Homo-oligomer: A and B are copies of this chain.
Amino acid sequence: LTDPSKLDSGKELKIDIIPNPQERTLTLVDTGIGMTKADLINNLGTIAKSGTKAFMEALQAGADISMIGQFGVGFYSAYLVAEKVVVITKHNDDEQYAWESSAGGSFTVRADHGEPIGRGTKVILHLKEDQTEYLEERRVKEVVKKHSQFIGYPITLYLEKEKEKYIDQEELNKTKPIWTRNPDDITQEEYGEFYKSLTNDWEDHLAVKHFSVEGQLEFRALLFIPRRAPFDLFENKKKKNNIKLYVRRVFIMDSCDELIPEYLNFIRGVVDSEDLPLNISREMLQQSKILKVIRKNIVKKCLELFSELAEDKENYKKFYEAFSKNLKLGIHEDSTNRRRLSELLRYHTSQSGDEMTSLSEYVSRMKETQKSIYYITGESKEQVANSAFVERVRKRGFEVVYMTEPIDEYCVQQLKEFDGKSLVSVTKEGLELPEDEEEKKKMEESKAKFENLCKLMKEILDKKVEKVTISNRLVSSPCCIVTSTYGWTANMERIMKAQALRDNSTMGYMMAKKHLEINPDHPIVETLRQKAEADKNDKAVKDLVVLLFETALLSSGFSLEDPQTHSNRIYRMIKLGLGIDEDE
């Protein structure tokens, strides 16, 4: 930059890798600065001395250089695979020399007389016979792409067959590290090509966020939301590659539960820092709390991206259908971010169409008399939509949230409220809709009118019901089964019984007790009152009450204890209607 004649010994800045299967050597060449005779003695001969840092010290007032090799111990990693190492080099201010050693306590320096090198250095490894792997085309490509793909000079690999007698493939370093540029210069085509190159995806990202941070901890990063959930995103047998951490553009680490929470594991990206307390090995970072502080800045940013994405209705629909499973797992686990994650949720509702609404959209449609958010859980939208539990709630025109996937039973345990309003299940004991004194009077007339029928139906069903009582929620059905306020709902029990590896010895504790509600306004129920009043011990009333109970149980979402008893009752009633004159 300041003495432009320096490059007249060779203008180009490059790296060449040259395996030799015939001679069992791997050669690396560069056109960099090279070494004098004094520099070969001092820098390759002295353990824990670095020419690199000395060079950096001689620079003044914040030069635009950021070099990698601080410690002064890495050169000797050559002997991990080599039996012997030769370094041939030439500086501008010196002759060409050879350095040679097999790490046997001594090294040799010699003036070289072979083909000239214009400037720079050639490293030659004579490989061990059980390390010949690194002469093969495939391992050299894997290693260079795994560790060095962002180094910022062209790395060219040479091979004696391809037709060509020397292929010279620069493609080992084809992709530029886009995150180093000012983002105002970067178009969606450039993010797109990078992201395909980072992830091997055949399709673009949905959204991308580029950001940076400054102070004691300095870094830049790229985070991508993919357009599709990965086919195997949730598999618990696969180690995740999703975020890579680089220092001064060389790869440090992977497999990182520390850098990002598991509920955000679909985000792909790169974090690149200029300065971190690296381990001697360069495989890891010394103060591991640093990773945690990097995480706390990633999560805030990830959530912001989702939030901004929620302003594009089209794209938020694509996102949410691929990753809605993720956000609800965040409500369950993240006791800090639960409150923002809830504003990202959307549901089908009864007042809505086939289009989904936010909880803040439920709240803006609430009547001034509503003090809670009503919801139902179940196995499908159709099954909950025609459900007996929602008949009076929809008759009175309240909105009901429909929750219909198994993960909804987990996040609703933890999301007690939204915007100060509590969630209340239409399936539990002790629901209330807003009061009307006329109705209250009718319920007091009704509980008096039916009192002893509830007593008989609690004598008949005694084993398997906590109480029998008048419904405040039924219309167009003679009864429903509802659960106690503590312990599991009807749906939670179904999910629990199917967990392949779960310990079921605690089921006797977590299953809730059943409550039976009757609709007193209903024909069957009022005629049952008259017949039960006519004679309390008529076995026909005991038979009718049990048949009603099983039917209600089934439609309420609970499995029957033995379905054959049930089917047999049906097959007997079918005969009676079908006109079998043989009663036998």
Contact = CB atoms under 8 A, between A and B. Distances in A.
Given A498-B495, A501-B325, A502-B406, A386 B564 contact: yes
Size range of the chain A interface in the assembly: 35 or more
A574 B531 CA distance: 14
Nearest to A385: B562
A503 B234 contact: yes
B527 A580 contact: yes
A524 B574 contact: yes
A537 interface: no
A579 B498 contact: no
Interface string A547-584: 11001101101011111101100110111111111100
Given A500-B406, A504-B405, A575-B523, A567 B582 contact: no
Contacts of A229: 503, 505
A406 B499 contact: yes
A407 B580 contact: no
Copies in the complex: 2
Contacts of A502: 325, 405-407
Contacts of A110: none
A499 B581 CA distance: 46
A88 interface: no
A548 B564 contact: no
A524 B578 contact: yes
B574 A544 contact: yes
A383 interface: yes
A412 to B, nearest CB: 13
Contacts of A560: 554
A331 to B, nearest CB: 13
Contacts of A14: none
Contacts of A505: 229
Contact of A577 (B405, B523, B566, B573): B573
A497 interface: yes
Given A498-B495, A503-B234, A575-B524, A567 B580 contact: no
A330 interface: no
A494 interface: yes
A382 interface: yes
A160 interface: no
Interface centre among A383, A501, A502, A575, by most chain B C-beta atoms within 10 angstroms, is A501
Contacts of A379: 497, 559
Contacts of A571: 478, 524, 551
Contact of A386 (B523, B540, B562): B562
A498 B499 contact: yes
Interface centre among A548, A567, A579, by most chain B C-beta atoms within 10 angstroms, is A567
Contacts of A406: 497-500, 502
Contacts of A382: 561-562
Contacts of A559: 379
Contacts of A562: 382-383, 386
16 contacts: A229-B503, A234-B503, A325-B501, A380-B561, A382-B562, A406-B502, A407-B502, A524-B574, A540-B578, A544-B574, A547-B570, A548-B574, A551-B571, A554-B560, A554-B567, A555-B563
Given A379-B497, A410-B500, 8 more contacts: A231-B506, A407-B500, A407-B502, A495-B500, A523-B575, A544-B578, A547-B570, A551-B571
